[PDB]
Amino acid sequence: MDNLESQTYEVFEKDPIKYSQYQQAIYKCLLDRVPEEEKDTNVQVLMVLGAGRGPLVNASLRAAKQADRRIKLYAVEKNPNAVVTLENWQFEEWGSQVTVVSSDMREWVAPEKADIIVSELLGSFADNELSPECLDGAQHFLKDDGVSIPGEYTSFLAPISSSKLYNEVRACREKDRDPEAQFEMPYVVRLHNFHQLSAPQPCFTFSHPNRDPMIDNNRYCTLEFPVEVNTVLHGFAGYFETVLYQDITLSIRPETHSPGMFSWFPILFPIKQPITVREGQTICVRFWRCSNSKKVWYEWAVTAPVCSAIHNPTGRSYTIGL
Amino acid sequence: MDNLESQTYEVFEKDPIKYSQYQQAIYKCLLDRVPEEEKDTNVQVLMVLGAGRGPLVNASLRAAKQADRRIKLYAVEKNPNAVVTLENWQFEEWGSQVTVVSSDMREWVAPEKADIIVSELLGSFADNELSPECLDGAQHFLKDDGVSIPGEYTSFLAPISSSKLYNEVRACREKDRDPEAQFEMPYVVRLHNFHQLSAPQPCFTFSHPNRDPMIDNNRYCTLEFPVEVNTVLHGFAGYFETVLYQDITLSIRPETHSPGMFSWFPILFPIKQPITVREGQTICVRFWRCSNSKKVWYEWAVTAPVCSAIHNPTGRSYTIGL
Amino acid sequence: RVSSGRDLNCVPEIADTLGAVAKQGFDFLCMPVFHPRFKREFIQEPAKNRPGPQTRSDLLLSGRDWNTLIVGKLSPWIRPDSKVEKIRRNSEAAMLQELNFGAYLGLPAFLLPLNQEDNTNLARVLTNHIHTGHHSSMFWMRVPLVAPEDLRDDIIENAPTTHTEEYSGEEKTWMWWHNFRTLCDYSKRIAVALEIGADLPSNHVIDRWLGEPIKAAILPTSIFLTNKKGFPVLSKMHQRLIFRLLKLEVQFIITGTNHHSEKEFCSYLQYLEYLSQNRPPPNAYELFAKGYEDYLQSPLQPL
Amino acid sequence: PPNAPACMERQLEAARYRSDGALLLGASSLSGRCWAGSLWLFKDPCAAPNEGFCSAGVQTEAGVADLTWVGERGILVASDSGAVELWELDENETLIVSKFCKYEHDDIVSTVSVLSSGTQAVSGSKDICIKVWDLAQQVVLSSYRAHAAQVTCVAASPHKDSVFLSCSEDNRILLWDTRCPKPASQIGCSAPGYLPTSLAWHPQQSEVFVFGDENGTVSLVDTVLSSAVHSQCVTGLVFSPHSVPFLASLSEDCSLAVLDSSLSELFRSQAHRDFVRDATWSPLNHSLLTTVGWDHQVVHHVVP
Numbered sequence A, B: 001m002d003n004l005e006s007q008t009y010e011v012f013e014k015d016p017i018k019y020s021q022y023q024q025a026i027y028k029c030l031l032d033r034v035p036e037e038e039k040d041t042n043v044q045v046l047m048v049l050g051a052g053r054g055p056l057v058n059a060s061l062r063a064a065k066q067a068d069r070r071i072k073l074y075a076v077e078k079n080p081n082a083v084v085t086l087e088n089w090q091f092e093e094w095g096s097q098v099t100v101v102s103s104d105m106r107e108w109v110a111p112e113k114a115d116i117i118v119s120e121l122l123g124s125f126a127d128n129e130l131s132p133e134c135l136d137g138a139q140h141f142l143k144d145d146g147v148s149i150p151g152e153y154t155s156f157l158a159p160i161s162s163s164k165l166y167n168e169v170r171a172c173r174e175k176d177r178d179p180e181a182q183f184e185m186p187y188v189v190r191l192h193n194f195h196q197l198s199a200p201q202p203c204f205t206f207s208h209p210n211r212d213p214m215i216d217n218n219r220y221c222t223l224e225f226p227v228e229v230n231t232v233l234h235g236f237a238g239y240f241e242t243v244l245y246q247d248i249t250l251s252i253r254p255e256t257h258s259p260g261m262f263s264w265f266p267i268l269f270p271i272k273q274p275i276t277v278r279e280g281q282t283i284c285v286r287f288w289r290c291s292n293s294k295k296v297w298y299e300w301a302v303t304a305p306v307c308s309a310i311h312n313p314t315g316r317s318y319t320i321g322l
Numbered sequence C: 001r002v003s004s005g006r007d008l009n010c011v012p013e014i015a016d017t018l019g020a021v022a023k024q025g026f027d028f029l030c031m032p033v034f035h036p037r038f039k040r041e042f043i044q045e046p047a048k049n050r051p052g053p054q055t056r057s058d059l060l061l062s063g064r065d066w067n068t069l070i071v072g073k074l075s076p077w078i079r080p081d082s083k084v085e086k087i088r089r090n091s092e093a094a095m096l097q098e099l100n101f102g103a104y105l106g107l108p109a110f111l112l113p114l115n116q117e118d119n120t121n122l123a124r125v126l127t128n129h130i131h132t133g134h135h136s137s138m139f140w141m142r143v144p145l146v147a148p149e150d151l152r153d154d155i156i157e158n159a160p161t162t163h164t165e166e167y168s169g170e171e172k173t174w175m176w177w178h179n180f181r182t183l184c185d186y187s188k189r190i191a192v193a194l195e196i197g198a199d200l201p202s203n204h205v206i207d208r209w210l211g212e213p214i215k216a217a218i219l220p221t222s223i224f225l226t227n228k229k230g231f232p233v234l235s236k237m238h239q240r241l242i243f244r245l246l247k248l249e250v251q252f253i254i255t256g257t258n259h260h261s262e263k264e265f266c267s268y269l270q271y272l273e274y275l276s277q278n279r280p281p282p283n284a285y286e287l288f289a290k291g292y293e294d295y296l297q298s299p300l301q302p303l
Numbered sequence D: 001p002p003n004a005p006a007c008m009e010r011q012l013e014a015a016r017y018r019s020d021g022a023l024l025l026g027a028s029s030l031s032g033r034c035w036a037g038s039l040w041l042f043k044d045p046c047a048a049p050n051e052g053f054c055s056a057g058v059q060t061e062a063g064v065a066d067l068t069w070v071g072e073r074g075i076l077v078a079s080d081s082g083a084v085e086l087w088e089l090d091e092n093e094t095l096i097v098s099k100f101c102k103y104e105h106d107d108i109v110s111t112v113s114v115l116s117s118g119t120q121a122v123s124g125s126k127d128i129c130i131k132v133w134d135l136a137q138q139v140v141l142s143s144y145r146a147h148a149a150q151v152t153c154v155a156a157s158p159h160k161d162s163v164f165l166s167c168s169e170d171n172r173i174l175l176w177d178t179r180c181p182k183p184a185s186q187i188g189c190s191a192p193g194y195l196p197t198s199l200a201w202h203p204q205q206s207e208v209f210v211f212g213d214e215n216g217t218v219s220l221v222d223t224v225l226s227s228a229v230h231s232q233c234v235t236g237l238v239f240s241p242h243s244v245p246f247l248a249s250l251s252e253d254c255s256l257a258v259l260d261s262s263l264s265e266l267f268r269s270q271a272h273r274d275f276v277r278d279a280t281w282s283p284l285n286h287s288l289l290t291t292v293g294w295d296h297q298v299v300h301h302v303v304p
């Protein structure tokens, strides 16, 4: 719903491990898609869905040269201020190899179907920038045997006790709105003075391309987190993990964190009211991913050791625009 | 975005002059569309777009019998609670003549194109329930020579001074929101203790079917209202007028008001701040109809004798959902 | 004088049955707005395109009758906390459909059951419907005074009934309701319809309920003892619980078939009227304070 | 036929063949102004469901959740009213008259099964009661409250009057012997699975039966072996009259399947357009199977 500024792109473009992971996913996919004897007869159709200023385009060029295969590139972007960068790059550098498209992927009628669709639409909680909805509206121009990079992603949650961050969400109260609205929204935050109470467990998972006859991106997941200390719960930390292609992966889960990758900080789903928790009890949290024709949102509640209140019912405090 | 309750339908169904005006529009259109020598060979396709509980369906049956012609009826409704009424009527009374459709007209794929599309999607300010957007999404299943009933509608505005209604909008202040939000929204109200300062003048007009190559329902209109007394402006009254077919018309404009038609009360666009006005000065008001892919709203400002502030910029206080 | 209602899951003709219960002596009716066996699919074909109409028509009754005489009932196959995903999804669609129809009709209240322990997804859907659209329809949560399982007959040879007293296990149903209500952030629109079983539970269970928002109390015909003549009556502990509820001022509801086939059905109702008239009389405090109950005033500052 | 109603209600709930070859169907009106039920006898099955080409018809006061043949003229009916009613066939088999209609259950009666005697029956309801009825006396001999949720299915053993099955939405399957002072005994998985919905006794091993759950899986048990047959709830299961019987399964996914004894599918039909409600095997043509659904279809299948 909003378009990113130029410096935002610039900072998250300066992360090397991410884009080289993407390069290698493309490299392995190109090899497994055309054998050595087709390396000059067969041109692969590549569509960067959500191309930005062109770091995935360049990493596609680099991967095609690592793997000595021919590719036809399409750089689909929706933000026209970023398209100005793409079209200047295409003039003075990429040339005719890259075809720049200034459209939403869900709305773009494509000339030909794609062999591979590359996307970087992932958030701190995997699907919270709505990678699913977009790629489901763009898979209709994917070859019946096509490959999406990434191919799947999973979100993760872990209960945390932090009195500092609880106070900071509390201070985020704003006039002209619900005085408790600030606890009914997630925050991207670099967690520091906090206490993780139980190891992350997976929440919602999405796969691309999704060949189900009725696609439903809504979700409901119930997680039980055994805690072995007394403590007072203040929220849940959110992390994610994604399969780019095969064994090539990216993760901000602290157990399997990709090293030196500052591109994603964790997310934080607070709860209005601190919930005191004893040695040996279990923390049960429920999470819903709800959507309508216009927006998408998360609802969440704690049911054990005591119930909380359903947070963000109806997206009344926080919604992600389509 | 919201579905009407059963008693709402019931009260606005009990207005005789409206539905008989509609009957006669249908009657005159049926005669001018098939001559006396086709009265048994030619079945007219009629689509009620926004059918409710079936008062327009019955008035279509009555008009087809007045005019001795054959019709094929479709009753398209989106509210499924009202569809329960339609489908029970179709079982025990209308029979196979009426085909009930439970869909949005913009989204419905139709079996065949229509000769006539009947709609009752009009508000106190004509287009404020979004008749335009809906009928533009439904005209693709209209015969290239088809007739929309109604065929056009015009909204009207007149400056008013009322200290009573100004105080009541003031009292409509609600917590958890902008303390001035209440003046940035229109109200359906039966104006009584008020002073109309200048005769209504037309604001926005829409025509159906709209055969323009680029349809743009957005608008900008500038009106100048000469006042011949000292007074203090508190808002603008809104009325409307609509051409059903030819000389058959409905109106709530006080000059040409359809008699005994209580179905529409006037609307009221207040202004935050009373604007004092002298004998002989002119009141200049600007009105915008703005829309995006998701909602539609009105913005408005006074520029003479002194500027007001642009009210409801960006739909921040009031929007009509698509 | 007592406000009284009749519960049914079988109403073939709405006009007829509503007349017959009103002639019995009843003020209102609890019925299903859809047929309780008419299960509806929203996702998979071919069942999702089943041809309408889905239920009876709103025109069978006046706005006034739907507003003052009918009380909705959620179909019993609607189970949003099912363990089966497909079932949860259809039940969410079906709940929204039935609750929005009740809103369409204008129903003063709408019944929903708390018969298991986990009612979290049920609560959420209700919370969403509350916050979606502008209405004031009330919601009566049907929660039993003792849980089915804790009331069953000890006739399962290889799974007997726990004869050990459990203090907090007998307060199971209250926590079903405390959880449901806490999840919905204490909505004024959500109230409790307390179902009363055959054998009452230890007094502490009864005591932990009349702090709660009881708007209805449900009495089945099966709990009524027969007396000398042939009329339905109630034990003394059951009668005491009744006296409590009429003091807390609630609407009684009779469910179940006629089990005293020698006397008609209004006899249960007459028993209720009887106790109402034959209650401990109101004293000067109770007569005078009446009408001020639970009314909050800022305190007087006479300086 | 005289006393027949002009229209039979759209939702066909039950269908059962008589030994001679007649088809009894029971239909309920689940939508629309009037919510009633009806019972019909078709001495020609390929004529179903025409009201004009039937041997006898009548209309009950309320919907028909389930019925079964009591002999060759009696018809046991599970009414939404909370009543179990017995309707009997005319001498000429052209009329249907209510013999008794007893209102003992406090909620929709959903299951009836007749015991091996034919003088006794058992009913399950949504009120959580199971009742044992004497069809002769017209009263309830015993009323059991063993379950903790609505009773979904009861299936009387084919050979012992004292023994019958029941399953409920409380995840319980009970085996009953009226001769024990604790009649019911709980069968099932070590761990809580999916709710059981349908019960069918085996016609040749007195200790073996099959049950289907709400997830679409059918299972074979002996007082293991299971297959995922349907995508949705298994509403019924019926054994063929063969020497070695075939198992018919019905689901809310509008499909029918016919399985052997390792529960390997052999026949598959999707002719039905709404929930496939009941299935009955022909007593004359053993490879012929009739099915009724909520789509007003009476469909006849040629099974290998």
Ligand SMILES: CC(=O)N1CCC(Nc2cc(C(=O)NC[C@H](O)CN3CCc4ccccc4C3)ncn2)CC1
Pocket: A004, A008, A009, A011, A012, A013, A014, A052, A122, A123, A124, A129, A188, A262, A263, A264, A265, A266
């Ligand atoms: C340079 C550098 O050393 N540091 C940059 C700032 C800091 N890190 C962050 C991270 C996030 C965070 O996680 N945000 C969520 C976003 O969805 C992340 N994605 C990444 C991919 C991408 C690509 C292009 C444009 C945007 C995005 C957003 N916020 C703000 N500071 C680490 C130090």
Ligand SMILES: CC(=O)N1CCC(Nc2cc(C(=O)NC[C@H](O)CN3CCc4ccccc4C3)ncn2)CC1
Pocket: B004, B008, B009, B011, B012, B013, B014, B052, B122, B123, B124, B129, B188, B262, B263, B264, B265, B266
């Ligand atoms: C009976 C009767 O004597 N009186 C009804 C109440 C009163 N009149 C009104 C009018 C409006 C008003 O104008 N609202 C704006 C709506 O868009 C109007 N349209 C009409 C068409 C229609 C059809 C079906 C359902 C809704 C609508 C809404 N509000 C509330 N009270 C006059 C006395």
Ligand SMILES: CSC[C@H]1O[C@@H](n2cnc3c(N)ncnc32)[C@H](O)[C@@H]1O
Pocket: A003, A004, A049, A050, A051, A052, A076, A077, A078, A079, A082, A103, A104, A105, A106, A120, A121, A134
């Ligand atoms: C590079 S981080 C995400 C990028 O994808 C772009 N993007 C996100 N969603 C879409 C979409 N639906 N269609 C096209 N580009 C998109 C964003 O505008 C941004 O450039």
Ligand SMILES: CSC[C@H]1O[C@@H](n2cnc3c(N)ncnc32)[C@H](O)[C@@H]1O
Pocket: B003, B004, B049, B050, B051, B052, B076, B077, B078, B079, B082, B103, B104, B105, B106, B120, B121, B134
């Ligand atoms: C009778 S007043 C307006 C009627 O038209 C119906 N309606 C409004 N917009 C649409 C739409 N886009 N598609 C179908 N019915 C509509 C409304 O739900 C209501 O029944």
